[PDB]
């Protein structure tokens, strides 16, 4: 049981329906792999520094979660199945390291 | 890995008395836990040698401690082996 | 015959030759020149003067399509790079900007022995 952070970048062109469906599958797969959600930050569409999947922008999701370590990899795989999901990055959470303090 | 609760479980299990973290029995026990963990890690990942060195060093340490116990108090030695189930 | 009137100028420079490709804003080429297009044949293509002649030639060929303002793109490290630049600067063409696009790998491929003591 460790605390991670899930970054997901998906298609910015999504209408509210398809978007809702993608997030539904995200929550679904999450509960399937047993990840408790501590909080969520939806940053929406932002302008990428380089083209990803030929599209100049992307829609962002950030989930701070806690899940059994053993299945984390096995989770990420699933999250990459959907065509609409172009980026997945899972990071072990870390205490913030301040500079110039 | 090896969580603190497991460590305390085995320590309290093999402790000669309350508060004893350092006795030969405790050390051999802890080492044995580590050794088993590592070997089960090495049934897969058999191509990882750097860790296998670690396994060698731990094994050696355990053998030396057990030898010491064997010298001082053969009763506690046989007891230790019996509870741990070493020597094969 | 298009009448583009604004476009890009690519400069490919190496210690051997310098060649200039003038394109529309989409990157599709219009005309081009080089040290070989001018009467130079051998090593003389690496000349700064060669590069000047080339740049000027491509520019004059671009006047024929009636072009005025261009963007310059520099690739390669070789002689006569800045000479081709200066050439284009006033050819009668207006130079809107200069950029060095020279591709540098993140070290993918093993260089030839000539270029080695690197990766």
């Amino acid at each position: 049981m460790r605390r991670y952070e899930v970054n997901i970048v998906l298609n910015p062109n999504l209408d509210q329906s398809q978007l809702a469906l993608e997030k539904e599958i995200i929550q679904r797969a999450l509960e399937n792999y047993g990840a408790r959600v501590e909080k969520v930050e939806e940053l929406g569409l932002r302008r990428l520094a380089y083209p990803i999947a030929k599209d100049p922008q992307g829609y962002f999701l950030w989930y701070q979660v806690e899940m059994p370590e053993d299945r984390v990899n096995d989770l990420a795989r699933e999250l990459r199945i959907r065509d609409n999901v172009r980026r997945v990055m899972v990071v072990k959470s870390q205490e913030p390291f301040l500079a110039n303090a | 890995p090896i969580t603190k609760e497991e460590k305390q479980k085995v320590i309290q299990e093999f402790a000669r008395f309350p508060g004893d973290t350092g006795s030969t029995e405790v050390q051999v026990a802890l080492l044995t836990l580590r050794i088993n963990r590592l070997s089960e890690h090495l049934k897969v990942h058999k191509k990882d040698h750097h860790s296998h060195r670690g396994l060698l060093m731990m094994v050696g340490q355990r053998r030396r401690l057990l030898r010491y116990l064997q010298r001082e108090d053969p009763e506690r030695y046989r007891a230790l082996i019996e509870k741990l189930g070493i020597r094969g | 015959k298009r009448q583009v009137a604004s476009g890009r100028a690519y400069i490919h420079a190496s210690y051997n030759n310098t060649i200039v490709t003038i394109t529309d804003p989409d990157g599709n080429p219009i005309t081009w020149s080089s040290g070989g297009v001018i009467g130079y044949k051998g090593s003389r293509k690496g000349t700064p003067y060669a590069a000047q002649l080339a740049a000027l030639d491509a520019a004059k060929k671009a006047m024929a399509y009636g072009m005025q303002s261009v963007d310059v793109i520099v690739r390669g490290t070789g002689a006569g790079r800045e000479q081709a630049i200066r050439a284009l600067q006033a050819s009668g063409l207006q130079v809107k900007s200069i950029v060095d696009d020279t591709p540098v790998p993140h070290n993918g491929c093993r260089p030839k022995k000539k270029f080695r003591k690197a990766s």
């Binding site: 970054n7 970048v9 932002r46 990428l48 520094a49 380089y50 990803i52 992307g58 950030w62 980026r87 990055m89 990071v91 870390q94 205490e95 913030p96 390291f97 301040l98 500079a99 110039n100 303090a101 | - | 520099v74 900007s97 200069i98 950029v99 060095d100 696009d101 540098v104």
Partner: protein, 73 residues
């Protein structure tokens, strides 16, 4: 000798391990997409070593460029 400014002294209170914050990290990148040296950043060994990893993390997400085109010249 980079006597213009040190990126640290030109900045306020901030978190180095945060890969999602662009408007700060961008200051640590050159005219090109390259990570600045200790001379320019004015960071320390530990700090710089963390900064690198967070920058790369941001790059992969698409928040920061791997490389850029050089203006002027």
């Amino acid at each position: 000798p980079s006597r213009k400014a040190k990126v640290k002294a030109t900045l306020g209170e901030f978190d180095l391990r945060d890969y999602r914050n662009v408007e700060v990290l961008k200051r640590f990148l050159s005219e090109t997409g390259k990570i600045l040296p200790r001379r320019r950043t004015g960071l320390s060994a530990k700090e710089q070593r963390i900064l690198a990893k967070t920058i790369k993390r941001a790059r992969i997400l698409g928040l920061l460029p791997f490389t850029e085109k050089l203006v002027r010249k």
